[PDB]
Design an enzyme around this catalytic site. Structure first.
Site, short mmCIF file in Angstrom:
data_model
loop_
_atom_site.label_atom_id
_atom_site.label_comp_id
_atom_site.label_asym_id
_atom_site.label_seq_id
_atom_site.Cartn_x
_atom_site.Cartn_y
_atom_site.Cartn_z
N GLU A 160 13.33 -30.78 -34.12
CA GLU A 160 12.76 -29.55 -33.53
C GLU A 160 13.45 -28.25 -33.97
O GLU A 160 13.75 -27.40 -33.15
CB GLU A 160 12.77 -29.64 -31.99
CG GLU A 160 11.86 -30.74 -31.44
CD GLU A 160 11.59 -30.57 -29.96
OE1 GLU A 160 12.54 -30.14 -29.26
OE2 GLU A 160 10.44 -30.85 -29.51
N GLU A 240 6.84 -37.76 -30.10
CA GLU A 240 7.46 -37.91 -28.77
C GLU A 240 6.44 -37.64 -27.67
O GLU A 240 6.36 -36.53 -27.10
CB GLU A 240 8.67 -36.97 -28.56
CG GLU A 240 9.83 -37.07 -29.55
CD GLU A 240 10.97 -36.10 -29.21
OE1 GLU A 240 10.99 -35.57 -28.06
OE2 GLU A 240 11.87 -35.88 -30.06
#
Ligand SMILES: CCCCNC(=S)N1C[C@H](O)[C@@H](O)[C@@H](O)[C@H]1CO
Ligand SMILES: CCCCNC(=S)N1C[C@H](O)[C@@H](O)[C@@H](O)[C@H]1CO
Ligand SMILES: *[C@@H]1O[C@H](CO)[C@@H](O)[C@H](O)[C@H]1NC(C)=O
Ligand SMILES: *[C@@H]1O[C@H](CO)[C@@H](O)[C@H](O)[C@H]1NC(C)=O
Ligand SMILES: *[C@@H]1O[C@H](CO)[C@@H](O)[C@H](O)[C@H]1NC(C)=O
Ligand SMILES: *[C@@H]1O[C@H](CO)[C@@H](O)[C@H](O)[C@H]1NC(C)=O
Ligand SMILES: *[C@@H]1O[C@H](CO)[C@@H](O)[C@H](O)[C@H]1NC(C)=O
Ligand SMILES: *[C@@H]1O[C@H](CO)[C@@H](O)[C@H](O)[C@H]1NC(C)=O
Ligand SMILES: *[C@@H]1O[C@H](CO)[C@@H](O)[C@H](O)[C@H]1NC(C)=O
Ligand SMILES: *[C@@H]1O[C@H](CO)[C@@H](O)[C@H](O)[C@H]1NC(C)=O
Ligand SMILES: [Cl-]
Ligand SMILES: [Cl-]
EC number: 3.2.1.23
Lengths: 603, 605
Positions: A160, A240
């Site tokens: 991320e 995710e």
């Protein structure tokens, strides 16, 4: 000649020239003892997963520069060969920053010996460390690639990055280039970001496949529309898909409903997307491995996550629900599913006081204290985790209260204050920066400082810990410090040297026996501290982690059976930080309790 | 030095000169796998018991003359050490007859090689073999006597002799002499009988301390006065206080209420009496070890007995309530109690038929049959347990059904009948002595005869088994027999020769495998096996013979399967010998199957 690749023409992966999509669950080997690695993996297969996904925490494996841990519970290569043996493919996520509610996002705290370092950027001291690390890790991973007979099919670069403030594209390009050098040109490299153009802007790169994450609250059509904007062709991927959510000490325990998860999972699979369920089993932050978020709030010992497998590996209603969703798409394996482990309440075990931290300094600090005019950080002093004692001498007289303060909020993260061996109270990062104290001129002022976990997300991952700015007493900067780094791990294992309102921080100890020759003993259990307040606990020298029943939501800590023994007695050690139920004339109160059910969701 | 004795002056035992009363529980080592011996004994200790009681079954140690079994699950020496290391004392009941719902009351079948032998008497032949057995067993028990550093404080001579017709006091005196010879003059010897002068008349002997037994139905005062008649001085002792009761195939499962057992235990303990709980854990009659009563009714595989600890060793509400009772009189050990084992449902496993019994004769009977004009019994054919095949030929065409009959009711105990490979039905001791058959002249007539268990109580314990008298067809005695003893245990362990040597269906063997994964700490687990669609037979897992299944009669539908015979990675092989009807015909394999579940069903219909 095995091949795994994206084909763009056709919006998918090809495994060995044939269409493929993965259905994976996250499992972190650093959070499950090796004793149980085959249990959790086999249960994962039985749910219909064709793959698992894991993070490699740099700091789990390189605790000091050039000093490596790859054995026993740190044997990542074995974990991947175990996954392969059981027929599972692997998505590897080696960071070097993994986030993951784990200490500093898996970054080693020794990086902070360069005070000014910009973590997660093309800062050249950061890059040179990362390159040494990749040069030890990735050659270990090369033979475990799919193309060379192993389970690894894709690899995540960074984690991320689009959420970090830095936006250093040359950092990414460096990582790509180094991964390509050690892994070859064939391995599928990818990135994972939040599903919104705001997050993908800094997180995506040419030559790395852009994927997204999101859970049950998100509009699934839109989440994938934002991925498609970056990759007009190739597979849809949610790296995710949240089955649950993290916790913080003092906040109610997070839960996500089974039907929400099932619903969204069915929707994701029906699009032909590849997906990873985060977490599938969460496990435990043993010892000092938990992370923290900003503004400072630490995550607890349990990483249960409300996942499909519970902290201890148990089969939940959520596990069976998702298995039934996966069944609508894939034939799922046959046979009975391995069970939740049996749990036994060993009952009440009495403990007695061994030594205050005060009295154990010969054994906690055999190399002697360091003298500084002003205070030093944990990093300056060569300790990363646990506890450091900061000691000065009172300059004025304080028969009347006098404010001891950290005016810049520099107690990172919590200090246990005593003056001439009399407990004064507590200082806390962000919540309590002043505390009134009393005593004589020349009286010893003691601060036991706890690193409660290094922040793992956001800007302030450069989290040194300790007294990071000065303390004042009646507004006068305190000076002349005797600083004691504490070797709690070694001292606990040696029973603090000798083997063969508040209280002073202290170590309490006791024993319990378990009969041998009993096929089903020992069993797993949960330990509870009714009447204790805050501290650390070991059994037989294994640091099971932190307790804090005065804040919750976690009351019990998980104890895996393989550390328990039958040939000799088991030793429980408690380091109580605030108040111990042991002064009283009744030794019966100086005690812990083993029970057969977790309490991880107290109000 | 160490002493255990009766103090007659004080109506008590003395242990090293100190007063002592025992609170015992029966556990039979031959009905619990060795693997769990320690688990059960610790469970017993934590209940508050300070002693255990057990039987040494002769037939379990001397299956043929001069040929002994004292290792593994037969190592009573180790059992008794184990109890001693846990701090328990032992009361030993070595028979030589033990009753105990066990094959022949523990007596070896080979004693019947003398047809006319009077068991439990001064018959010199019975005596010579008893003597020889005691010369072997008793010297092994000597160092386990209390006074020599072991746990054994008292020893029972015989078992309820007063209930037996013979009343041969020379027999009792001979036992008493030989027990003294081997163990010495200080060991406490005792007898047990029903609490009533009719039982005590023949059971009691000068020099042996007289104890009684009785359960929750009996008036305690009356029972102990009957004891006082024969021993006016010395301790009060109920050697078998019934926690539950025995079963037979086809009757409802016996239970006794927790309150009744608890209140009675209290009143016995309050009188300062020594007491043994029969059974504390009952366990299992594996293989062919069950017994029977007369008129012929066999006890089943489970010896759960509704005991405080269940067949597989579980803590029941009854356990906790007796422990609470015991607490009112003594310190009970501190700490938590080892738990009930975990149970696992491995689920359905499919079986397929390998070979009929007729097809497997070569491997069941490798030294060949015995030929005889008239039928021979199990004993004459050198087989004690299991099955024997009797074969002959029809001497007349039976295209019209003709009656096969055992006029004197001598099919002991069940025969499965076939003609030229076509099953014809069943002959049963007592119930059906005639079966109609069809077939051609000179067709082969096969009777598969099952010993369902030798009687363990009453006068008819000399129960030979097999065809004990003639058969007739159309009233004429059938002659010219070919008789095969069947080594079913060997054959099943070699998978019927397959692994080498390093409405009715034909009796046949059905095999299937199942796997259990390795590297999982909590597998394998204890389980229970169930036989939906099957009728009556024997079952083995990896060659361990778990006993007999008869879901057709009940009350028992599941058999207990202990974890330690199951293995990981390597295939687990189930062998079912079905005798009457298997569910394996229809073009549907899913039905030819057994199922493993995680709760027992011994208490149904
Ligand atoms: C509440 C702040 C969010 C931080 N965490 C985020 S964004 N997450 C995504 C991240 O990649 C993963 O490591 C996990 O940390 C997950 C939450 O459990
Ligand atoms: C139905 C007849 C029962 C005979 N058994 C008797 S009298 N019993 C007393 C005997 O001593 C014991 O071995 C056990 O056999 C007990 C019954 O469990
Ligand atoms: C998601 O957003 C789309 C437009 O992108 C809208 O049509 C759709 O109804 C939304 N679905 C849900 C479940 O909100
Ligand atoms: C400390 O005590 C002083 C005087 O009693 C008081 O004014 C002040 O509010 C106190 N501060 C704290 C943080 O307790
Ligand atoms: C503390 O104070 C001194 C003098 O005011 C300052 O120069 C120094 O940087 C400070 N040190 C820390 C650790 O805050
Ligand atoms: C271990 O166990 C007991 C607890 O009952 C404790 O009191 C004892 O002192 C301990 N012994 C050693 C050698 O640590
Ligand atoms: C039992 O019998 C005796 C007779 O000997 C009698 O006195 C008493 O009433 C009875 N006691 C109980 C509890 O039934
Ligand atoms: C046998 O057959 C005869 C007919 O001849 C019949 O009378 C009899 O009832 C049958 N017997 C049995 C035992 O079924
Ligand atoms: C069998 O039959 C004959 C009657 O002729 C008899 O002599 C013999 O004793 C009988 N045998 C048995 C075992 O019943
Ligand atoms: C079952 O058991 C053993 C396993 O090695 C073997 O002899 C037999 O052939 C097996 N059959 C199957 C279907 O597994
Ligand atoms: Cl992961
Ligand atoms: Cl007994």
């Amino acid at each position: 000649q095995r091949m795994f690749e994206i084909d763009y023409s056709r919006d998918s992966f090809l495994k060995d020239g044939q269409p493929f999509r993965y259905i994976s669950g996250s499992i972190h080997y650093s959070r499950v003892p090796r004793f149980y690695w085959k249990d959790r993996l086999l249960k994962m297969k039985m749910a219909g997963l064709n793959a698992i996904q894991t993070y490699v925490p740099w700091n789990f494996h390189e605790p000091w520069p050039g000093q490596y841990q790859f054995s026993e519970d740190h044997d990542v290569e074995y974990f991947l060969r175990l996954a392969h043996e059981l027929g599972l493919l692997v998505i590897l996520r080696p960071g070097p920053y993994i986030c993951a509610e784990w200490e500093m996002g898996g970054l080693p705290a020794w990086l902070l010996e360069k005070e000014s370092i910009l973590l997660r950027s093309s800062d050249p001291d950061y890059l040179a460390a990362v390159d040494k690390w990749l040069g030890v890790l990735l050659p270990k991973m090369k033979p475990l690639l799919y193309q060379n007979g192993g389970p690894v099919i894709t690899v995540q670069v960074e984690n991320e990055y689009g959420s970090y403030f830095a936006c250093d594209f040359d950092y990414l390009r460096f990582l790509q280039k180094r991964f390509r050098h050690h892994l070859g040109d064939d391995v599928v490299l990818f990135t994972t970001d939040g599903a919104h153009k705001t997050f993908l802007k800094c997180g995506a790169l040419q030559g790395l496949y852009t994927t997204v994450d999101f859970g049950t609250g998100s509009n699934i059509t839109d989440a994938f529309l934002s991925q498609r904007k970056c990759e007009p062709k190739g597979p849809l991927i949610n790296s995710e898909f949240y089955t649950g959510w993290l916790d913080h000490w003092g906040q109610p325990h997070s839960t996500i409903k089974t039907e929400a998860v099932a619903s969204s999972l069915y929707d994701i699979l029906a699009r032909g997307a590849s997906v990873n369920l985060y977490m599938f089993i969460g496990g435990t932050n043993f010892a000092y491995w938990n992370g923290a978020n900003s503004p400072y709030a630490a995550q607890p010992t349990s990483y249960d996550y409300d996942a499909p497998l519970s902290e201890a590996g148990d089969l939940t209603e959520k596990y069976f629900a998702l298995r039934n969703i996966i069944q609508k798409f894939e034939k799922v394996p046959e046979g009975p599913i391995p069970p939740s482990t049996p749990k036994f309440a060993y009952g009440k075990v009495t403990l007695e006081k061994l030594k205050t931290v005060g009295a154990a300094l010969d054994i906690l600090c055999p190399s002697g204290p360091i003298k500084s005019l002003y205070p030093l950080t944990f990093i300056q002093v060569k300790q990363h985790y646990g506890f450091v004692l900061y000691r000065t001498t009172l300059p004025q007289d304080c028969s009347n209260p006098a404010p001891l303060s950290s005016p810049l909020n520099g107690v990172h993260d919590r200090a246990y204050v005593a003056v001439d061996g009399i407990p004064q109270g507590v200082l806390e990062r962000n919540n309590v920066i002043t505390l009134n104290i009393t005593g004589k001129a020349g009286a010893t002022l003691d601060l036991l400082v706890e690193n409660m976990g290094r922040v793992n997300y956001g800007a302030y991952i450069n989290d040194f810990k300790g007294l990071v700015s000065n303390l004042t007493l009646s507004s006068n900067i305190l000076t002349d410090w005797t600083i004691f780094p504490l070797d709690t791990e070694d001292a606990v294992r040696s029973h603090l040297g000798g083997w063969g309102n508040y209280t002073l921080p202290a170590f309490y100890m006791g024993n319990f026996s378990i009969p041998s020759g009993i096929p089903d003993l020992p069993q797993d259990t949960f330990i509870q501290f009714p009447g204790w307040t805050k501290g650390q606990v070991w059994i037989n020298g294994f640091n099971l982690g932190r307790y804090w029943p005065a804040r919750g939501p976690q009351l019990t800590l998980f104890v895996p059976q393989h550390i328990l023994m039958t040939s000799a007695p088991n030793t429980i050690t408690v380091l109580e930080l605030e108040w111990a139920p042991c002064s009283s004339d009744d030794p019966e109160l100086c005690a812990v309790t083993f029970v057969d059910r977790p309490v991880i969701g107290s109000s």
